[PDB]
Structure formats: structure tokens, C-alpha cells
From a paper:
The glycans have been shown to play intrinsic and extrinsic roles in protein folding, modulating conformational activation and immune evasion. The transition to the ‘up’ state exposures of RBD for the binding to hACE2 is also a prerequisite for S-mediated viral fusion, directly correlating with infectivity. Here, we dissected the role of N354-linked glycosylation, acquired by BA.2.86 sub-lineages, as a RBD conformational control element in attenuating viral infectivity.
Notably, the N354 glycan resides in a cleft formed by the NTD and RBD from two neighboring subunits, and establishes hydrogen bonds with T167 of NTD and with E340 of RBD, respectively, acting like a ‘bolt’ to lock the S-trimer in an ‘RBD-down’ state.
Numbering used by the authors:
A (entry chain C): 727 to 1064
B (entry chain A): 968 to 1144
C (entry chain A): 47 to 68, 80 to 138, 158 to 210, 212 to 246, 263 to 482, 484 to 677, 689 to 726
D (entry chain B): 534 to 581
E (entry chain B): 727 to 774
Write the structure that this text describes.
């Protein structure tokens, strides 16, 4: 499920009138058409931050797995964080990060190497050349991973009790028995085929890693979000080369070519084209942000129910009779293991 | 906002320019104001869609938390939900989720089952818990120890397949009578 | 109301020069002057304005007296001490109520602080004043608005400024205005209670963009920051041969319009001063370009079509024009980028007994599409005769521009030439006479590479520019690399510094300290830019070495990084949150604390069961 | 005429509406009126 | 409950410029104001 999108802070002054005093002065004739767009993008960025906060920051106290890891036979090494890795992420969590490629990290501070780009300057340098930047998320993908580690350790050592109040430790075999009892099968079934169910759990967990490894893209939703954002941004920057019926598409050119009282007409045409394109971008971003907010509210509900407890609602937390759910952080989204 | 017209006042540029002169400026003002109004309408549509999403969420919350007990965790407030009370607010609703939250807890001990005589006993409902020397059965969200009797537990097993079983004596109210 | 204005105001906490008296320096005047003084009864009469204060340029005088004023506009000579000695070409006298007012409470203790503001915006000399009976001994710091008194459309040139003195037997507070944005708080009675500048402090700018006087705790995106260029480089090609404009202009047999001689101009430097010199201009109307800005442009190719035509026909020659010349003789294309030059030539196209050498076409089978010559003598058909000859119904197509030294203005032999340029993307062989400065790399500069204007940072490259390649771009069609015309090397181009400034402040009811965050920029770059004073932002927030923090989200100035971890109070980005914490109070940034570190007591047979319970009512909105 | 919908041409400021006495505190140089959204609110009567 | 709406796939090129080469060339100067709309409606149909 997607949880957030790339945060942008479009500045219309630089985007529409690159360091042009005359263009800025003519833009002031359009009223507060700009502060609206800046405010809308600010609201979208704050909304993305709130979405990630709702989805992941569900547990006030950060829990940790016990130093020893023997959960009655259940093998959780695939979703528990790896101390060896510098990033401290799960093996199944690493695959998602390596299977999603962000066009612009935002947290690069790439200025200084656009001159050093040597080759053709890339999308990020081009976007910086025309007032189009990306803010980074408030929650880094390292502390989000620690939120997910806390959520996972809370559901394997304390069952669902930590989702209500104080986290009460309970052996995993007994938690399994209680989840089973929650769907109408008595505990004796689990306590009589504990080894078999542990083997099935280990096999399923192991074979989901390969199912994600070998598949072309099962994360098509998150990559879809990333592609949609990058593609909207690329269409935005591509509108800077459209004449819109003017003599030329370069403000510095038509300013250096025509004297002000004549160039005002062409600059006005450029304003009325670029403002319309920017408003199109802002409206599409608002619609996508509403969709992503709906998806993130759904993901937060799914976390709060499937993870912090057993859900009696059929087919909501995966297909079949739900038992638990282990969240795993993904780039601009969350991945559940029902 | 002039929008690139001579002036931003309709009654002015009408009284200051004959129709042909005013027409062009009037067209500029119309194309500016109409565009601003479309922006406002689109923002209102998006905000109304968001508010409708929030209102459907509120309606679901009312129908579940208020008119009943919700078994879904962290939906009707944090903790085990008990009941809710709506409160009308300006352009919205305010809920008072009354929630049951546990408190002070004690390590005791636990075992999946109790083997009395070659047969495994499991709790009918609740946990098998131990003071430290006398095994007990009790509910899950409250410590109410009870003597382990044949009605508190159901027997199914062979005392050899359950991992973690503990030797203890169960009680039956029929042998005495 | 919290109305926001943009006009000339004295910048807050700016420089004001305080004078004394016991000779009378001539203060320069520009963009308005803030004037203030504090005297016992009267020692300052008025002011003198104008340029050079002599009998060659109009000047001003606003001398006051006991009962009225003496505002006038004249060309006085001097007084070197009545107040002048020349009123020859002098008008626009003016008399009204005296500007100075003095009241004393039976004691000379009160010294009214008189403040004045003047300006000369589109003429209309504006004067503002306000007398505060408060003794101004120590320049007061409370707010006091200024009311206009008079406003007279003077319409002269004012650069210098002086003042007058009184006779007898601590004042002169002067400041200079600047174009700044102000936010003004209007009282319920219509007066102004408090105003805040919008280019002084990060707090002031946030307060401006969040129009209010109380800014709640949070982070506000206000503006952006840009490294303004320091040097401006222009790199024009390695050619110095002046263009052949002289040859075509110094010609005498300018061909007729039916055969418009078209010369190609390339591989030369076009200095249009020679265009001006051999030209008693009559019509220099230019379409694609401004004739003023012609020495700073580079054109791929320049055409010059020369043809002598009649008086009305020059106003008849233009892009997509019509008529006997603009339809069958010479038609300029609609999207013409260039212009026409026309000057009377009655000495070279005339002689006694008359001259009929020139020609012009009146009869063509159809319209002439732009830029076509139609040299041909075919008799125009009328009716349905294939007639080949002259007479009636058989007309020789082209008629004669007979020229003699005696015609009216509508008929004199106007010498018309047109210049057509191609201002598109391609190596320009023709450029203006602008000198080629040196090349500076790794420094934000304005470049004019072969007429390609822009701003950014340039440096060496490891591209594989093919020999014919001249430009660079990206999938977004933005000029990336430019080959140096005089070095034949590849230079990448960088954004200037473009970023984004977000001010991080707690509520103004708490403290005035703020934290500034420049988005997506290495803080070394903004530090050198600040030290070079090339940053567009003018609010120079302090940097003591302890308030700099290269965040993953930009860099933070004005907050010190603490290695502790607290709850997130003001979100910054990338796991950083700012808050106002005690030391004795300052702003600190820290990596957010996700929660209290807890470890569960999981074991094979250990379980936790709550022996008690609580009822908590939470609220959801 | 006050308290009646009229078309006004106050000193070249055209418009329509209803006028009445106010308790404003117009400064002696004050001539026009407005509001937060910059719309003409009050006009000083040229002949009164 | 509605589950889907009509899947529309308007083409801007014809909708604005009915088989007019001049209008197509003038539209080309507006950049990718067309591919955006086509992609948006295609996404809408796929989502339906
Ligand atoms: C839990 O599951 C892990 C899966 O990664 C097991 O790790 C394995 O370690 C062996 C080496 O002994 C590797 O060959 C194998 O590929 C895998 O990495 C781990 O042993 C297992 N532990 C328990 C207690 O079940
Ligand atoms: C095991 O649980 C017993 C509860 O019945 C506790 O024993 C009690 O001990 C008192 C005397 O100390 C008796 O009077 C009472 O009837 C009861 O048997 C006992 O404390 C508890 N064990 C531990 C270690 O707490
Ligand atoms: C529970 O009690 C059983 C008998 O009451 C024990 O079984 C015994 O097991 C031993 C071997 O450990 C045999 O030698 C003996 O004959 C008898 O079968 C059982 O071990 C015991 N379990 C625990 C955990 O105490
Ligand atoms: C706006 O102007 C009003 C008219 O003068 C002021 O009301 C006056 O208040 C004084 C006391 O300060 C009274 O003596 C007088 O009768 C009248 O009520 C009002 O205060 C003023 N408001 C401001 C300046 O904010
Ligand atoms: C237009 O008239 C120009 C000036 O007479 C011509 O330029 C010159 O032409 C002479 C030959 O008459 C050359 O010797 C000289 O070098 C220069 O080019 C130009 O050719 C002429 N063009 C046309 C198309 O008639
Ligand atoms: C469970 O928790 C209750 C409150 O959380 C306890 O009630 C308290 O009772 C004492 C008097 O014994 C009061 O002073 C206090 O204010 C509170 O009301 C209750 O005793 C407690 N019960 C157990 C078994 O722990
Ligand atoms: C259970 O015992 C462990 C072992 O030290 C301890 O850390 C934990 O706090 C105990 N839990 C209780 C007493 O609730
Ligand atoms: C005003 O001038 C003094 C004298 O040099 C200077 O010290 C001070 O910094 C100036 N004010 C400001 C705001 O720079
Ligand atoms: C002051 O100026 C007025 C302006 O004309 C003049 O009439 C008058 O004589 C001057 N002197 C006094 C004392 O008023
Ligand atoms: C006023 O200006 C005219 C301008 O030609 C000049 O001739 C005349 O001498 C001037 N009057 C003087 C100097 O008194
Ligand atoms: C005003 O005076 C200044 C100073 O000499 C001069 O540079 C400027 O060109 C003048 N302007 C006009 C309009 O005379
Ligand atoms: C031709 O050149 C001579 C050189 O002395 C110059 O005097 C004359 O004005 C020129 N004629 C034209 C039409 O440029
Ligand atoms: C430019 O011209 C100068 C002078 O002729 C010459 O020394 C230099 O090598 C030239 N550079 C190039 C790149 O042609
Ligand atoms: C940005 O970060 C630091 C601080 O300036 C320095 O290493 C260099 O300027 C940049 N480094 C990289 C890797 O871009
Ligand atoms: C305290 O902060 C400094 C950086 O200011 C850091 O190098 C150091 O490791 C921190 N100490 C602790 C105990 O976290
Ligand atoms: C749980 O049992 C396993 C296997 O019997 C053992 O390796 C582990 O140390 C035990 N842990 C505790 C806390 O009893
Ligand atoms: C307007 O003029 C008339 C006639 O001069 C006079 O009676 C009246 O008082 C004047 N009113 C104002 C407000 O100037």
C-alpha cells in the first residue's frame, strides 16, 4: 500500500520568471495566484508527513526483540532487523528498497556537482535550473524501519496487548493458541501440531522472499506512485520549452531581444501559459494526494487492526482466516505480511 | 487584480472606454476572474471530496463505536473499546471513546497445557498461570485465578505431543459426590 | 486590517546620519529622504532641492516663515549665505499654511520631534509629516505614523538636497528610503499602530508571508534564496571583421523593388553605429528586435534587401503588408524578425531633365508570397486574349518610378533597405560589437555565450562534443553545456543556487529567536555565499559556528544541534525536529525521539497478566 | 440620499449601493475607504 | 453502490482541431498539454 508521495515546494516566481524583475512585476498583476499554489503544496507535504505518522507511529513505546530468538519454533529472522547490516533492516525489507528506484531522493543537496555532472545534466539538475525542488520526508527510512521493528517486536513478544495498553509478554506458542481460538479452532490443535505449523510458517516466510525476488515487479503500486510523481514533474519542466504563441520560450532571450513595452505582450503570454501548466500540476498533485491519503488511511486502519490484533473481518487482512500481520517498510509505502 | 487590463474596476473601465476599447480589457478581466473561479471551484471540489471521506469515516465510527461494541483494535480509541458518546461540534463531530486499558501486571509463569493423568488439559477460556507453587487458570485481560477443575478445562491429547506441558493435578467435582 | 503594501519606506534599523549646527553639507537625494529634527522654537526654515543648484537647471525651494510657506520651482543663481538672486524663467509659485507648528506648556522644555518624508515618484512631489510634542532628545523608538500635508506635481529632476538655518544672537536626523515591502496594522480608529518590515529578519519575513503580527509555533515556508552572480561574462566569437553595411549603404544604384537586391551578411561583427551614421533616418521601425538592443545580439544570418521606393510605399512595406508594392513587388513574411531603414535620397536619384531609370511592378498574375523575386516581362492578360504586346487589354506589367529633383514628400525617392535576421539556435556568425571578457569558472556568473544569455556556474567537462555540436541539453530541453567560441571547450552550466528558505520559530509570544533552514543546499555553499554577500536574501542571520547544521534536508542556521533525543516539536525534515528549550533560552535541533526505549521480557514460559485495569476516555475529532 | 439603493458617481468613483452616516474617524487627508479585501467601503462627501 | 463510471478517452487533437493541420501546428506550441489529458483518462479507465 502506498503511504506517501514525493513532497514538492514549487516556487512560481523562479519557475515562471527566472530571475526576471520585469517578469516578476508583470506576475504581481495576477494577484495571489501564487500563494495559493505554494500553500497547496505545503499542505500536501504536511499531509504526506501526517500520513506516514498515522501509518507507522502507532506505538508510543519502542519495543525490542529479546536477545535470544526462539519463538517456539517460528523463524522470524526474515522480518526481524539484521544487526549486521549498517541500515538495521529486515532481509525482506532490503528487497523492497533494492526493487524501487527513486528518480530524486530530495535529500541529496546535489548542488555543486551539476557543474561536475560532466555528461548531460540529469533530471534533478534540470529541475533545480527552473525552480522545481523536492523536500525530503520528515521520517527517514531508517527511523521508519525502527518504528516497524518496534511494531513487529511488539506483536511477537506481547501479542495484541501492546496495541491496547502496557505490553504484556506472552510466549509465542500461547499467542498462536489465542489467535487460533479467535477463529473458532481450539488451542489443542496448535499444541498438538506445533512442529508442523512452525514448519509451514517457516516455509511460507521463506518462499515469499523468493516470490518477491524473482517476480518482475510485485511492488507495482509503489513504483506506480513514484513513476506518476516523476512523470508529472517531468511534464511540468517540459512546459518551459513551449512557446505558448510567443516569439521564443526563453524569458532571458525575449527580454534581451525586445524592449519592455513590446516584450510585455510576449511575457504575458508566457505567464498565462506557465501559470496554467503549474495550476494543472498542482490540481493533479492535489487529486493524487487525496488518493494517497485515502490509501494511507486504509493502510493505517489495516496496521491498527491486522497488526495490533486479530481482525474478524473476512478477506480484509489477507485471504483466509487472519492470524497476524507483520508490517515491512517500503519506499513511500508499507508492505504487510498477512 | 488587473490581470493585465487597464484597471480592475468594471464600472470604471466601462465608463472610461467605449465598448470596443473596453471589450478587450473586459475580455482580459473575464478570462482572469473566470480562471480564478475555476481554481476556487476545483479546490472546493477536492476539499469536499476529502470532507466526504472524513464524513464517511465519521458515519462508520458512529455506527460502530456508538451503536455497539467494536472488536477492531485502535478504531474506537486506543485500547479495548467499551462504548462511545458523540458530541456535536461546529462542522464536525467529537467522539468520547470509553476504553478499557489494562494496568499493573505480574510475571507469574505459564504452560500451554496441564497433564493430570496421561491426558492434556487446556483452558476452556483463559490462561494457565502459576503463582509460583500452585497452578491456576485465569482470564486473559484480568488476573482472576481459579482452581483448575474439569469444567474450567477440556481434555484432548496424550501428554506426549504438547511442548511445554506441566505436571499438575486437575480437580473434578464428581468423584467426591 | 493587516494591509500589506509595497512602496518606498525607511528600512527598519537602518543608517541615519545625525548632524549638528553652530558648513551645511549638500546631502544627496535619491528615492526619497526621511527628515527629522528637534529644536526649541525655530532654527530650520526649509530645504532646497534640484540639480547643481545653478541657473542652468530647474530647482526647488520650500522655505517656511512665521505665517506661510514659500514653495516654488525656479532656476535661482546662488545666495552663498535674498535666499537667491535670479527668478528669470521661474513659475509654479505656491503658498499655503506653514509646515512647522510649535506649542509650549508655558515652558521651553517641550521640543516637538518634527519628522518629515519626501519623495519624487513620477514627479508628484510628496511631503509627509508628523509633529510629536515628545522631546526627541534621544531619537524615540515608539511608532508614529506620517500624514501627508501637500502633494504638488513638481516634475523636475532632483538629485541633491540642502537645508536652511535661522538667526540668533541636536537636529538634522536624515535617513534614506528604499523600495521595500511593509505590513501595516491599522487601528480600529483608522490610525496605524504597528508595522513590520518584510526584508529585515527571518521572523519579520515569516510574519509578512503569514500576514499577521502573531506567528504561532511552527515552520513556515516564506521565500527562496539565490546566489546573485558576481561577475558577468560575455564570450563572443573570434572575429573582428566589420560587416559590409558600409558597402551596401555607400552604393548608389540601389535596384528597383521588382528586383530587390539581396545581400548576405555573415562572418562579421555588426556595429550598428555605422548603420546610424550613413542614415538620415525616417523610418527605423523594428519588429522582431528592439533597435536599441541590437549591439548585444547574435544572429545566424543577416540579409539586406535594398530597393528605392516612393514616399507612401515605405509605410506600405512591412511584415504581411498589402498594396501595389507589398503584393506584386515585395512582400515581407508575417513572422518577420528584423526591420526596414528608409532615408530620403533626392541627390542620387534625380537630375535635370528628369530620370526614369527605376521600375516597379503593378501587374502580376497573383500575389507575391514572402521573399520572392519575380523578374519577368510578360504582358498581363485581361478578358480572354492571349495578346502579346502593349495597348488596351494588353498591358506591359511593370510601370516606371520616374524620379526628378522636384516632387512632394509623398513622391520623393525614398531609399529603403530591410535587414532580416534569423534569431534561432545555431552557431551565430554575426554578433554585436560587445567585447569578449575573460572566462571565470566554478563561480556563479551571467554568461552571454554567442548570444545565449543566462546565469549559472561553468567549469570543465568530459563530454564527447562532436565537431559540429555547439550546445547541450537534457530530456527536458534546457541548455546544459555550451562550447566556448574562443576556446572550443565544453562548459557545463549549473543553476545559480536555487533553493528554499523556511523559518522555524516558536510563537512570538514566547521569543523572537528563529531558525532559518535553506532547503537542499550544502551549508558551506551558503556560508561562502553569505561571506561574499552574493546571496539574494538580505536578512543575514548570525553564524557563530555553533549555529550551523548540515541537515539531510538542507542546512539549519540559528539553531544548535543537541545529541539528545526529545519528542518532535517542529518538524524539519529527515529525522530532525526543532524546539525551544532552556539552556538561558535558545532554539535547538535534534534527531527526533521515536519513543521510550522498551524491552519486553519474552520467555518460553513467562506471561504477564494485568491484575488491575483502568478506564480511559480519549477524544476523536 | 441615504438609506436607499442608488448609483453613485462620487468624485469619479462609480458604483451602486446604499449610503448612510458613519462614525468613522477619517483623517483630514483621508478621502476614500476600503476593507481587508480592498473593496471601496466609504467615500468622503466632496460637498459635505 | 456505484462501482464504475463510463470510460471516456477523448483525443484532444481532434476535439480542439477537427482535421486541421494549421490548428494542429498551433496546438503543438502548447507543449504536452495533450499527453497529460490522454494519460489521465487512460488511467481513469484502467482504474475503472
Ligand atoms: C531461521 O531462518 C534463517 C533463514 O535465513 C536461517 O538462516 C539460514 O542459515 C543457513 C546457514 O546455517 C543458510 O545456509 C541459509 O541460507 C539461511 O541463511 C536460520 O538458520 C533459521 N534459524 C532457525 C533457528 O530456524
Ligand atoms: C500460591 O497460591 C496460593 C493461593 O491459594 C498462595 O497460598 C496461600 O498461602 C496462605 C498462607 O501463606 C494460605 O493461608 C492461603 O490459603 C493460600 O494457600 C501462595 O502465596 C501462592 N504462592 C506464591 C509463591 O505466591
Ligand atoms: C510428569 O509425571 C509423569 C508421571 O507421573 C512422569 O513420567 C515419568 O517419566 C519418567 C522419565 O522421566 C519415567 O521413568 C517414569 O516411569 C514416568 O513415566 C513425567 O516425567 C513427569 N513430567 C514432568 C515434566 O515432571
Ligand atoms: C477612537 O475615537 C473615539 C472617539 O474619540 C474614542 O472614544 C473616546 O474615548 C475617550 C477616552 O479615551 C472618551 O473620553 C470619549 O468620550 C470617547 O469615548 C476611542 O477611544 C478611540 N479609539 C482608539 C483611539 O483606539
Ligand atoms: C547588390 O549590390 C551590392 C552593391 O553594389 C553588390 O555587392 C557588391 O557587388 C559587386 C559587383 O557589382 C562586387 O564586386 C562586390 O564585391 C560586392 O559584392 C551585390 O552583389 C548586389 N547583389 C545583387 C543580388 O544584386
Ligand atoms: C486498581 O486500581 C485502582 C485505581 O487505578 C485502585 O483504586 C484506588 O484505591 C485507593 C484506595 O485503596 C485510592 O486511594 C485510589 O485513589 C484509587 O481509587 C484499586 O485499589 C486497584 N486495585 C488493585 C487490586 O490493585
Ligand atoms: C519479568 O521478569 C523480567 C526478568 O528480569 C523483568 O525484566 C520484567 O520486568 C518482569 N516483568 C514484570 C515483573 O511484570
Ligand atoms: C549605521 O552606521 C554605523 C556607523 O558606521 C554602523 O556601525 C552601523 O552598523 C550602521 N547600521 C547598520 C544597521 O548597519
Ligand atoms: C511669510 O510669508 C508670506 C507668504 O506670502 C508673506 O506674505 C509674509 O509677509 C511672510 N512674513 C510673515 C511675517 O508672515
Ligand atoms: C528663458 O529660456 C529661454 C529659452 O530659449 C531663453 O532664451 C531665455 O533667455 C530665458 N530667460 C531668461 C534667461 O531670463
Ligand atoms: C537627473 O540628474 C542626474 C544627475 O546628473 C542625471 O544622471 C539624470 O540623467 C537626470 N535625469 C533627467 C531626466 O534629467
Ligand atoms: C559614400 O562614401 C563617401 C566617402 O567619403 C561618403 O562621403 C558618402 O556620404 C557615402 N555615401 C553614402 C550614401 O553612404
Ligand atoms: C582567437 O584569435 C586569436 C587571435 O587571432 C588567436 O591567437 C587564438 O588562438 C584564437 N582562438 C581560437 C580558439 O581560434
Ligand atoms: C556536500 O557536503 C559537504 C559539505 O559541503 C561536502 O562534502 C561537499 O560540499 C558536498 N559533498 C557531496 C558528497 O556532495
Ligand atoms: C554529543 O554530541 C556530539 C556532537 O555535538 C557527538 O559527537 C557525541 O557523540 C554526543 N554524545 C553522546 C553521548 O551522544
Ligand atoms: C527456551 O527453550 C529453548 C529450547 O528448549 C532454549 O534454547 C532457550 O534457552 C529457552 N529460553 C528460555 C528463556 O527459557
Ligand atoms: C460649497 O460651496 C458653497 C458655495 O460656495 C458653500 O456655501 C458651501 O459651504 C461649500 N461647502 C463645502 C463643503 O465646501
Amino acid at each position: 500500500l502506498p503511504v506517501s508521495m514525493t513532497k514538492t515546494s514549487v516556487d512560481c516566481t523562479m519557475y515562471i520568471c527566472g530571475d526576471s524583475t520585469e517578469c516578476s512585476n508583470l506576475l504581481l498583476q495576477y494577484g495571489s495566484f501564487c500563494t495559493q499554489l505554494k500553500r497547496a503544496l505545503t499542505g500536501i507535504a504536511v499531509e504526506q508527513d501526517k500520513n506516514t505518522q498515522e501509518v507507522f507511529a502507532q506505538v508510543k513505546q519502542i519495543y525490542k526483540t529479546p536477545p535470544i530468538k526462539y519463538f517456539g519454533g517460528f523463524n522470524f529472522s526474515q522480518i526481524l532487523p539484521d544487526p549486521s547490516k549498517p541500515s538495521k533492516r529486515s532481509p525482506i525489507e532490503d528487497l523492497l528498497f533494492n526493487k524501487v528506484t527513486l528518480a530524486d531522493a530530495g535529500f541529496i543537496k546535489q548542488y555543486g556537482d551539476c557543474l561536475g555532472d560532466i555528461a548531460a545534466r540529469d533530471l534533478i539538475c534540470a529541475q533545480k535550473f527552473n525552480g522545481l525542488t523536492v523536500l525530503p520526508p520528515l521520517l527517514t527510512d531508517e527511523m521508519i524501519a525502527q518504528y516497524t521493528s518496534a511494531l513487529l517486536a511488539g506483536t511477537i513478544t506481547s501479542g495484541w496487548t501492546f496495541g491496547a495498553g502496557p505490553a504484556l509478554q506472552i510466549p509465542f506458542p500461547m499467542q498462536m493458541a489465542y489467535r487460533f481460538n479467535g477463529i473458532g479452532v481450539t488451542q489443542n490443535v496448535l499444541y498438538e501440531n506445533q512442529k508442523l505449523i512452525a514448519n509451514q510458517f517457516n516455509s511460507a516466510i521463506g518462499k515469499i522472499q523468493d516470490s518477491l525476488f524473482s517476480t518482475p515487479s510485485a511492488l507495482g503500486k509503489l513504483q506506480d506512485v513514484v513513476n506518476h510523481n516523476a512523470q508529472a514533474l517531468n511534464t511540468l519542466v517540459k512546459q518551459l520549452s513551449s512557446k505558448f504563441g510567443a516569439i521564443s520560450s526563453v524569458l532571458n532571450d525575449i527580454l534581451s531581444r525586445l524592449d519592455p513595452p513590446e516584450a510585455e505582450v510576449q511575457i504575458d503570454r508566457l505567464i498565462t501559459g506557465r501559470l496554467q501548466s503549474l495550476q494543472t500540476y498542482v490540481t493533479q498533485q492535489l487529486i493524487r494526494a487525496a488518493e494517497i491519503r485515502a490509501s494511507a488511511n486504509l493502510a493505517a486502519t489495516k496496521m491498527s487492526e491486522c497488526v495490533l490484533g486479530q481482525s474478524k473481518r473476512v478477506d480484509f487482512c489477507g485471504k483466509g482466516y487472519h492470524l497476524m500481520s507483520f508490517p515491512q517498510s517500503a519506499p513511500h509505502g508499507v508492505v504487510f505480511l498477512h | 487584480s488587473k490581470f493585465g487590463a487597464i484597471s480592475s474596476v468594471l464600472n470604471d473601465i466601462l465608463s472610461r472606454l467605449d465598448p470596443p476599447e473596453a471589450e478587450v480589457q473586459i475580455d482580459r478581466l473575464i478570462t482572469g476572474r473566470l480562471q480564478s473561479l475555476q481554481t476556487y471551484v476545483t479546490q472546493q471540489l477536492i476539499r469536499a471530496a476529502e470532507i466526504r471521506a472524513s464524513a464517511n469515516l465519521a458515519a462508520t465510527k458512529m455506527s460502530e463505536c456508538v451503536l455497539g461494541q467494536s472488536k477492531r483494535v485502535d478504531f474506537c480509541g486506543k485500547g479495548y473499546h467499551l462504548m462511545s458518546f458523540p458530541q456535536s461540534a461546529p462542522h464536525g463531530v467529537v467522539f468520547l471513546h470509553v476504553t478499557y486499558v489494562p494496568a499493573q501486571e505480574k510475571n507469574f509463569t505459564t504452560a500451554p497445557a496441564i497433564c493430570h493423568d496421561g491426558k492434556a488439559h487446556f483452558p476452556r477460556e483463559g490462561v494457565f498461570v502459576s503463582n509460583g507453587t500452585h497452578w491456576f487458570v485465569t482470564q486473559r485481560n484480568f488476573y482472576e485465578p481459579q482452581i483448575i477443575t474439569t469444567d474450567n478445562t477440556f481434555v484432548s491429547g496424550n501428554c506426549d505431543v504438547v511442548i511445554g506441558i506441566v505436571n499438575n493435578t486437575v480437580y473434578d467435582p464428581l468423584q467426591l459426590e | 486590517v493587516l494591509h500589506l503594501t509595497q512602496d518606498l519606506f525607511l528600512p527598519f534599523f537602518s543608517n541615519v546620519t545625525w548632524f549638528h549646527a553652530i558648513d551645511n553639507p549638500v546631502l544627496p537625494f535619491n528615492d526619497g529622504v526621511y527628515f527629522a529634527s528637534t529644536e526649541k522654537s525655530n532654527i530650520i526654515r526649509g530645504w532646497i532641492f534640484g540639480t547643481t543648484l545653478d541657473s542652468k537647471t530647474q530647482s526647488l525651494l520650500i522655505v517656511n516663515n512665521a505665517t506661510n510657506v514659500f514653495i516654488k520651482v525656479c532656476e535661482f543663481q546662488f545666495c552663498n549665505d535674498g535666499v537667491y538672486s535670479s527668478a528669470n524663467n521661474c513659475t509654479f509659485e505656491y503658498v499655503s499654511q506653514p509646515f512647522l507648528m510649535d506649542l509650549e506648556g508655558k515652558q521651553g522644555n517641550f521640543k516637538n520631534l518634527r519628522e518629515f518624508v519626501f519623495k519624487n515618484i513620477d514627479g508628484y512631489f510628496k511631503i509627509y509629516s508628523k509633529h510629536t510634542p515628545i522631546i526627541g532628545r534621544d531619537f524615540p523608538q515608539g511608532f508614529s505614523a506620517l500624514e501627508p500635508l501637500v502633494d504638488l506635481p513638481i516634475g523636475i529632476n532632483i538629485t541633491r538636497f540642502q537645508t536652511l538655518l535661522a538667526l540668533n544672537r541636536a537636529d538634522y536626523y536624515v535617513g534614506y528610503l528604499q523600495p521595500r515591502t511593509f505590513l501595516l496594522k491599522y487601528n480600529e480608529n483608522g490610525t496605524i499602530t504597528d508595522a513590520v518590515d518584510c526584508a529585515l529578519d527571518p521572523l519579520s519575513e515569516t510574519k509578512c508571508t503569514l500576514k499577521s503580527f502573531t506567528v504561532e509555533k511552527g515552520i513556515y515556508q516564506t521565500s527562496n534564496f539565490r546566489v546573485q552572480p558576481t561577475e558577468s561574462i560575455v564570450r563572443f566569437p573570434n572575429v573582428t571583421n566589420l560587416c559590409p553595411f558600409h558597402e551596401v549603404f555607400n552604393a548608389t544604384r540601389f535596384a528597383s523593388v521588382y528586383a530587390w537586391n539581396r545581400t548576405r551578411i555573415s562572418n562579421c561583427v555588426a556595429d550598428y553605429s555605422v548603420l546610424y551614421n550613413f542614415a538620415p533616418f525616417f523610418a527605423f521601425k523594428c519588429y522582431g528586435v528592439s533597435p536599441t538592443k541590437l549591439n548585444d545580439l547574435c544572429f545566424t544570418n543577416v540579409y539586406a534587401d535594398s530597393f528605392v521606393i516612393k514616399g507612401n510605399e515605405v509605410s506600405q512595406i512591412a511584415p504581411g503588408q498589402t498594396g501595389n508594392i507589398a503584393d506584386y513587388n515585395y512582400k515581407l513574411p508575417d513572422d518577420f524578425t528584423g526591420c526596414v531603414i528608409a532615408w530620403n535620397s533626392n541627390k542620387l536619384d534625380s537630375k535635370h531633365s528628369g530620370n526614369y531609370d527605376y521600375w516597379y511592378r503593378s501587374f502580376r498574375k497573383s500575389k507575391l508570397k514572402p521573399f520572392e523575386r519575380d523578374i519577368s516581362t510578360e504582358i498581363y492578360q485581361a478578358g480572354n486574349k492571349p495578346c502579346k504586346g502593349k495597348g488596351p487589354n494588353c498591358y506591359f506589367p511593370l510601370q516606371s518610378y520616374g524620379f526628378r529633383p522636384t516632387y512632394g514628400v509623398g513622391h520623393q525617392p525614398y531609399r529603403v533597405v530591410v535587414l532580416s535576421f534569423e534569431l534561432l539556435h545555431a552557431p551565430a556568425t554575426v554578433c554585436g560589437p560587445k567585447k569578449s571578457t575573460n572566462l571565470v569558472k566554478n563561480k556563479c556568473v551571467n554568461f552571454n555565450f554567442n548570444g545565449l544569455t543566462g546565469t549559472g556556474v561553468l567549469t570543465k567537462s568530459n563530454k564527447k562534443f562532436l565537431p559540429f555540436q555547439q550546445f547541450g541539453r537534457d530530456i527536458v530541453d534546457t541548455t546544459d553545456a555550451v562550447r566556448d567560441p574562443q576556446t572550443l571547450e565544453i562548459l557545463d552550466i549549473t543553476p545559480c543556487s536555487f533553493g528554499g528558505v523556511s523559518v522555524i520559530t516558536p510563537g512570538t509570544n514566547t521569543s523572537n529567536q528563529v531558525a532559518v533552514l535553506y532547503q537542499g543546499v550544502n551549508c558551506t555553499e551558503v556560508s561562502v555565499a553569505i561571506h561574499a554577500d552574493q546571496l539574494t536574501p538580505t536578512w543575514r542571520v548570525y553564524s557563530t559556528g555553533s549555529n550551523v547544521f548540515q541537515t539531510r534536508a538542507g542546512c539549519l542556521i540559528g539553531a544548535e544541534y543537541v545529541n539528545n533525543s526529545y519528542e518532535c516539536d517542529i518538524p524539519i525534515g529527515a529525522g530532525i525536529c526543532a524546539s525551544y528549550q532552556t539552556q538561558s533560552q535558545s532554539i535547538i535541533a535534534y534527531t527526533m525521539s521515536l519513543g521510550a526505549e522498551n524491552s519486553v521480557a519474552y520467555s518460553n514460559n513467562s506471561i504477564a497478566i494485568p491484575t488491575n485495569f483502568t478506564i480511559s476516555v480519549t477524544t476523536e475529532i
